[PDB]
Every structure is written in structure tokens, then in C-alpha cells.
């Protein structure tokens, strides 16, 4: 629950931009919370992560 790509389409919204540097709410593909994003480089992700 609250992660994946089997998403219900009852409550519809539009894809916003990842606003870095502000205290934002987020629903990233089911993952929800409040936070502050920061753009970074990252070599640790494979194609399955």
C-alpha cells in the first residue's frame, strides 16, 4: 500500500513540478508526506531501484 504503479484514478490531479527548496507536500507515485526537496546527482540507483 502507498507505493507502486497500480494507481486508482478516482481523485485526479495533474503532474506538477518537483519544486526544490520549498516546504511542500508530495505524493510521489503513492509515497506521501511533507518535506523539502533538493536536486542532486546520484550514481547509486540501478534500473530496478
Amino acid at each position: 500500500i502507498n507505493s507502486g504503479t497500480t494507481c486508482s484514478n478516482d481523485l485526479l490531479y495533474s503532474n506538477t513540478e518537483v519544486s526544490t527548496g520549498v516546504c511542500v507536500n508530495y505524493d510521489l507515485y503513492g509515497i506521501t508526506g511533507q518535506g523539502i526537496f533538493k536536486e542532486v546527482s546520484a550514481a547509486y540507483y540501478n534500473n530496478w531501484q
Binding site: 500500500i1 502507498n2 506521501t32 508526506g33
Partner: protein, 50 residues
Amino acid sequence: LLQQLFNKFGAISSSLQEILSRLDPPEAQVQIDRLINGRLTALNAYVSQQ
């Protein structure tokens, strides 16, 4: 003292975000009450040791 925020104390989760995104208000309260009792017990013991 910080590691006490990740115990369940017999609830379904240690996270208050995971409980309030899965259960209705009458049944989320029963789970929240267990976390509240555990965390108050841990704060009480810390203050006695200080």
C-alpha cells in the same frame, strides 16, 4: 531515546503517517493510543534517570 520512535508497542506501525492513511478515525485512535502510551513511558523513564 530517539530509537523509541520506531517501536510499535503492539500497534500496526510505528509511523503516524502510515496509520492515518489506512484507517478510519474510530479505529485509528485505538492504534494511536498505544504509541502515545509507549512514548510517554519512555519519556518518564528518561526523566527519572536524569
